[PDB]
Amino acid sequence: ASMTGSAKLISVTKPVVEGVNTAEELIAYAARVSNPENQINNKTASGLLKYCIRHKHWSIFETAFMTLELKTSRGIAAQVLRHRSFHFQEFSQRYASVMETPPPHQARPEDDQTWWATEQEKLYAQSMELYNKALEKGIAKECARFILPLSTPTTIYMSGTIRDWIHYIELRTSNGTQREHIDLANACKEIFIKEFPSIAKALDWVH
Amino acid sequence: TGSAKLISVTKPVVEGVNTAEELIAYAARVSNPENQINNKTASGLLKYCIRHKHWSIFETAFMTLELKTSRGIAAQVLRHRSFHFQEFSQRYASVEDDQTWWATEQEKLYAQSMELYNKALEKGIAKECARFILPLSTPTTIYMSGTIRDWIHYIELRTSNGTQREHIDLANACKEIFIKEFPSIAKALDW
Amino acid sequence: TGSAKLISVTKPVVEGVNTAEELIAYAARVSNPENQINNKTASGLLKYCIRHKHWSIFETAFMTLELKTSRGIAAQVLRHRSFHFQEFSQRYASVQTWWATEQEKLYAQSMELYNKALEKGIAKECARFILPLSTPTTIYMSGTIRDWIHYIELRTSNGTQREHIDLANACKEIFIKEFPSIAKALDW
Amino acid sequence: TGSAKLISVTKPVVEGVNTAEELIAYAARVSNPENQINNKTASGLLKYCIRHKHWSIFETAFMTLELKTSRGIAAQVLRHRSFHFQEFSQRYASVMETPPPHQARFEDDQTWWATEQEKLYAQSMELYNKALEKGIAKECARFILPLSTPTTIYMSGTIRDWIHYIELRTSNGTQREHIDLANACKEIFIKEFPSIAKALDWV
Ligand SMILES: Cc1cc2nc3c(=O)[nH]c(=O)nc-3n(C[C@H](O)[C@H](O)[C@H](O)COP(=O)(O)OP(=O)(O)OC[C@H]3O[C@@H](n4cnc5c(N)ncnc54)[C@H](O)[C@@H]3O)c2cc1C
Ligand SMILES: Cc1cc2nc3c(=O)[nH]c(=O)nc-3n(C[C@H](O)[C@H](O)[C@H](O)COP(=O)(O)OP(=O)(O)OC[C@H]3O[C@@H](n4cnc5c(N)ncnc54)[C@H](O)[C@@H]3O)c2cc1C
Ligand SMILES: Cc1cc2nc3c(=O)[nH]c(=O)nc-3n(C[C@H](O)[C@H](O)[C@H](O)COP(=O)(O)OP(=O)(O)OC[C@H]3O[C@@H](n4cnc5c(N)ncnc54)[C@H](O)[C@@H]3O)c2cc1C
Ligand SMILES: Cc1cc2nc3c(=O)[nH]c(=O)nc-3n(C[C@H](O)[C@H](O)[C@H](O)COP(=O)(O)OP(=O)(O)OC[C@H]3O[C@@H](n4cnc5c(N)ncnc54)[C@H](O)[C@@H]3O)c2cc1C
Ligand SMILES: COc1ccc(CC2=C(O)C(=O)c3ccccc3C2=O)cc1
Ligand SMILES: COc1ccc(CC2=C(O)C(=O)c3ccccc3C2=O)cc1
Ligand SMILES: COc1ccc(CC2=C(O)C(=O)c3ccccc3C2=O)cc1
Ligand SMILES: COc1ccc(CC2=C(O)C(=O)c3ccccc3C2=O)cc1
C-alpha cells in the first residue's frame, strides 16, 4: 500500500496547573471541577470522557488545542481547508516555490493504471519545466503557480481544539471518503491516539 | 476575468422593515433606544456602530454570492474561515514578448492536461482521480456565504494594495453587489 | 414561559428558487449532476445529505429568531457560539407555593431597589448587578440552518432544562414552517 | 474587581522552537522562506504580520485563562464567540461566595447603594440556601441569584483572538469591571508573549 498522506505533531496544549501535566489530564480536570457534585466523577479517565462525548458536554474537549503538520496534495488540501473550525498555515504564495516534483496519483486495468502514471509524469515534468522557465524569465511565483497541477505536494499546519479533531478524524476515516484523505486522517488519528489515550479508548480507536 | 452574482440575502419579516440593511439599522435602534445616535441618518448610525465595534447588528444579516474564479485565487478565498462555501462535487462533476511566451506556453500546457483529463474520463477513471492533473488556473465557481460584518472585512482586506490582482478583481465584483444591497453601509465606509 | 418569533430568513434572488429551503434543495442537486441520488424527493435528498454529513448546503441558508426567555436560560443559549446574538444595550435599555411566594417577594424587592437606583441617576450597567437570573430577556438569535438543526435537536432532547425545552420547541415550530422538507428529513 | 490566572498554553515540539510565541515567529519564517522581513526580530516580524493581516501564524498558538468575575460581566465575555468557555455545572455546582456590592456611577449615595446591595444580596443567599434545604434543584435555585454573583470561567482562545479581546476590552468607554478583567488578562498575555506585547506596545 502507497502512503499518500503524512502528519506530524507540531504543538499541543500544556497545563500550568499543579498536578495536571497533559492536555488530556486538563480535559479530565475540566470535567471533574465544573461538575463536582456528580457521581460520574468517580469513573475511569476514558469512561468519564466517554460519558461527556455521549452527553454532548463538548466544552471540556475545547480547553485543549493541537497543531499537526500535514504533507499531502493541493487537490486534497482543497477538502481539508473546508473544515472551518480549524486554523491553517501554508507557504507564502509569493515567497515560496515548489521544490518536490509532483508524484503520480493512483486511479479507481493494470496497463490502464501504468498509462495514467506515465501520462501524469509526462505532464508534471512539462509543468515543472515551464515553472522554472517562467521563474528564470522573472515571472513572480504567484503568477507561475497557476500551471502547477492539483497533485502538487503540499505541507500545511492544521490547528484545532480536541473536539474539532475528534469529528474531523471520525469523518475522514469513515467508509467512502477519498483514499488520499483517509491516509491523511489515519496519519492524524495515529498522532491523536498517542497524545489522547483515554479519548482514543472512549471512542474505541486502536493503533 | 473574475466575476460575482448575488444568489441570496436576508429578508426580514418584521412589519415595516423590508431589506436586510433596514434590519441592521432597526437592530441598532431597538437594542439602544435611549441612545442619542438613533437620531442620526441610516449611514450615520452604522458608521458609528462600525467605529465602536458593535459588530453584532451586522451579524443579523447574511449574503450568498456566486464567485467565478480560478483554483489559485480560491486557495486564498477559502482561507476566510468565517464564510461558508459551496463548490461542485469532486466525484459527480466535470470541467512584453515574455508575456506572449507565458500565454502561448500556458495554452499549450493547458490543452495537454485537458486532453489527458478527457482521455482519463473515457477510459473510466473516476473524476476525483482525474482532477489531480488540472492546473491551479482551472476555472471554478463557488458560493461564498457569510454575515455582513464578514463581507465588510473580506472586501476591505482583498481590495487593499498588495493583494494579488486577480483577487482584487473578484473582491471589486463583490464590492459592487455589496454597494447595491447595502448603500447606507457603503456610504458609512466611504466606498 | 419561553417563546420565539421569526425575525428574518434568507431569500434567494435566482430564478426558479424562491424560498431558503429551495436554495438548499437547489444546492444539494446542482452539487451532484451525475449522481442518481439527485432523483430522490426534496426531503429524501436532504435526508441523504444530513446522513452523509454534506453540511455546507445547510450553510447557504440563514435564519434569525427573537427569543423571549430569561437570563438563566440565556446562560445556556449564549453558549451555542456558532450563533450570532443581538441583545438590548447594557447601557441604553431598562427592564412549590413557598418557592413561587418567596420568589415574588424577592423579585418585587429587586425592582424597588432597581427603580430607585435609576430614579437616583445610577448608570443602567450598574443597576443590572442587582438583577436576578429570572429577569426576562428578549434576544435575537441568528445562525445558519445547519446550526439551527443541531441546536433544536440538542435542546428538545430529554435531560435539558424544561424552560430551555419550551424555548427550543418554540424554535422547532418556526423551523418546521420554513423548512418542511428538512423537518421531514429529520422526522420532526 | 476581577482577576485572571493562566490555565494552559500551547507547547511546541519542533526543534529550536520551545514556546508558543517562538512557534508563532517560526510559523511565519517557515511559511515565507524567500522573504527579507524574516531577518527582523521576533517583535519586528510579528509587528509586520499584525499590520499586514497575516493572522494565521497567530492562530497556531492557544491559551486558556481562568477568570474570576461577576455573572453580569461573564454575560459580556461569553459574546466573544471565537473563544471557548468552561463553566461550573448549572445542576452539580453550588454558589458558595456571597455576591459583593458593585460600585455605582452616573459618598452618601454610594453608601446607600452598597448597603442596599448587601441587604438584597444576603436576602437572596438565605432564600437560595433554604430552597436547596427544601430540595429545590440547583438549576431551579439559581434563578433568584443576582447578576453580581461571582463566577469562575475558563476562557480558551487562539493568540489572534486574545490580541483583539485585550485591545477591545482595555479600550476607552468599556465597563470598569470589564477593563479590570481585560487588564488581568493583558498582564498574563504580556508575560507569555513579550515580543507580541512589544509589537503592540503593551507593558
Ligand atoms: C498580506 C497577507 C499575507 C498572508 N500570508 C500568508 C502566508 O504566508 N501563509 C498562509 O498560510 N496564509 C497567509 N495569509 C492568509 C491569512 O493569515 C488569513 O488566514 C486569511 O487572510 C484569512 O483571514 P481571516 O482568518 O481574517 O478570515 P475572515 O473570515 O475574513 O475573518 C475571520 C473573522 O475575523 C473578523 N475580522 C477580521 N478583520 C476584522 C476587523 N478589522 N474587525 C473586526 N472583525 C474582523 C471577521 O469579521 C470574521 O468574523 C495572508 C494574508 C494576507 C492578507
Ligand atoms: C460525503 C461528503 C460529501 C460532500 N460533498 C460536497 C459537495 O459536493 N460540495 C461541497 O462544497 N462540499 C461538499 N462536502 C463538504 C462538506 O459540506 C463540509 O462543508 C466539510 O466537510 C466541512 O465540514 P464541517 O463544516 O462540519 O467542518 P468542521 O470544521 O470539521 O466542523 C465544524 C464544526 O462542527 C463541529 N461538529 C462537526 N461534527 C460534529 C458532531 N457530529 N457532533 C458535534 N459537533 C460536531 C466541529 O466540532 C466543528 O466545531 C462534502 C462532505 C462529505 C463528508
Ligand atoms: C448535558 C449538557 C451538559 C453541559 N454541561 C456543561 C458544564 O458543566 N459546563 C459548561 O461550561 N458547559 C456545559 N455544556 C455546554 C456544552 O459544553 C457546549 O458549550 C454548549 O452546549 C454549546 O455547544 P456547541 O459548541 O456545540 O454550540 P453550537 O453553536 O450548537 O455548535 C457549534 C458548531 O458545532 C456543530 N455541530 C454540533 N453538533 C453537530 C452534529 N451533531 N453534527 C454536525 N455538526 C454539529 C454545529 O452545527 C455548530 O456549527 C453542557 C451541555 C450539555 C448538552
Ligand atoms: C461599544 C460596544 C457596544 C456594544 N453594544 C451592544 C448592544 O447594544 N447589544 C448587543 O447585543 N451587543 C453589543 N456589543 C457586543 C458586540 O457587538 C459583540 O457581539 C461583542 O463585542 C463580541 O465581539 P466579536 O463578535 O468581535 O467577538 P470576538 O470573538 O472577539 O471576535 C470574533 C473574531 O473576529 C476577529 N476580530 C475582531 N477584531 C478584529 C480585528 N481588528 N482584526 C482581525 N480580526 C478581528 C477576532 O480575532 C475573532 O476571530 C457591543 C460591544 C461594544 C464593544
Ligand atoms: C501579489 O500577490 C499575492 C500577495 C500576497 C499573498 C499573501 C497571501 C495571501 O493574501 C493568502 O491569502 C494566502 C493563502 C494561502 C497561502 C499563502 C497566502 C499568501 O501568501 C498572495 C499573493
Ligand atoms: C471517492 O472519493 C471522494 C468521495 C466523496 C467526495 C465527496 C466530497 C467531499 O467528501 C468533500 O469534502 C468536498 C469538499 C469540497 C468540494 C467537493 C467535495 C466532495 O465532493 C470527494 C471524493
Ligand atoms: C435539568 O436541567 C439542566 C440540565 C443540564 C444542564 C447542563 C448544562 C447545560 O445544558 C448548559 O448549557 C450550561 C452552560 C453554562 C454552564 C453550565 C451548563 C450546564 O451545566 C443545566 C441544567
Ligand atoms: C461602561 O459600561 C458599558 C458600556 C458599553 C457596553 C456596550 C456593550 C458591550 O460592550 C457588550 O458586550 C454587550 C453584550 C450584551 C448587551 C449589551 C452590551 C453592551 O451594551 C456595556 C457596558
Author numbering:
A (entry chain C): -3 to 104, 119 to 217
B (entry chain A): 0 to 94, 120 to 215
C (entry chain B): 0 to 94, 123 to 215
D (entry chain D): 0 to 105, 120 to 216
Paper quotes:
The last step of dTMP synthesis is the methylation of 2′-deoxyuridine-5′-monophosphate (dUMP) to dTMP. This N5,N10-methylene-5,6,7,8-tetrahydrofolate (CH2H4folate)-dependent reaction is catalysed by two distinct families of thymidylate synthases, ThyA (EC 2.1.1.45) and ThyX (EC 2.1.1.148; flavin-dependent thymidylate synthase (FDTS)), without detectable sequence or structural similarity. Whereas human and bacterial ThyA proteins use tetrahydrofolate (H4folate) to reduce the methylene moiety after its transfer to the uracil ring, ThyX proteins use a non-covalently bound flavin adenine dinucleotide (FAD) cofactor to facilitate hydride transfer from NAD(P)H. Recent studies have demonstrated accumulation of a 5-hydroxymethyl-dUMP (5hmdUMP) as an acid-trapped intermediate during ThyX catalysis. ThyX has a complex fold with a central a/b domain flanked by two helical domains. It forms a tetramer with a 222 symmetry.
In order to obtain further insight into the mechanism of ThyX inhibition, we solved the crystal structure of C8-C1 bound to PBCV-1 ThyX at a resolution of 2.6 Å. The space group was P1 with four ThyX homotetramers per asymmetric unit. C8-C1 binds within the catalytic pocket between two ThyX monomers (hereafter called monomer A and B). The C8-C1 binding site is conserved and partially overlaps with the dUMP binding pocket observed in T. maritima and M. tuberculosis ThyX. The 1,4-NQ moiety binds in the same cavity as the uracil ring from dUMP and is sandwiched between the FAD isoalloxazine ring on one side and side chains from Gln-75 (monomer A) and Gln-89 (monomer B) on the other side. The binding of the 1,4-NQ moiety is further stabilized by four hydrogen bonds: the carbonyl group at position 4 interacts with the hydroxyl group from Ser-88 and the main chain N from Gln-89 in monomer B. On the opposite side of the ring, the Arg-182 side chain from monomer A forms hydrogen bonds with the 1,4-NQ carbonyl and hydroxyl groups at positions 1 and 2, respectively. The aliphatic parts of the Gln-75, Glu-152 and Arg-90 side chains form the wall of a hydrophobic pocket that accommodates the 4-methoxybenzyl group of C8-C1. This pocket is distinct from the one accommodating the dUMP phosphoribose moiety; hence, the binding mode of the inhibitor is distinct from dUMP binding. Comparison with the structure of the FAD-bound form of PBCV-1 ThyX shows that upon inhibitor binding, a long loop located in the vicinity of the substrate binding site (residues 89–104) becomes ordered and participates in C8-C1 binding. When the IC50 at a fixed enzyme concentration was plotted as a function of the dUMP concentration (indicated as [S]/km), a linear correlation with a positive slope (r2 ≈ 0.97) was observed, indicating that the molecule C8-C1 acts as a tight-binding competitive inhibitor with respect to dUMP.
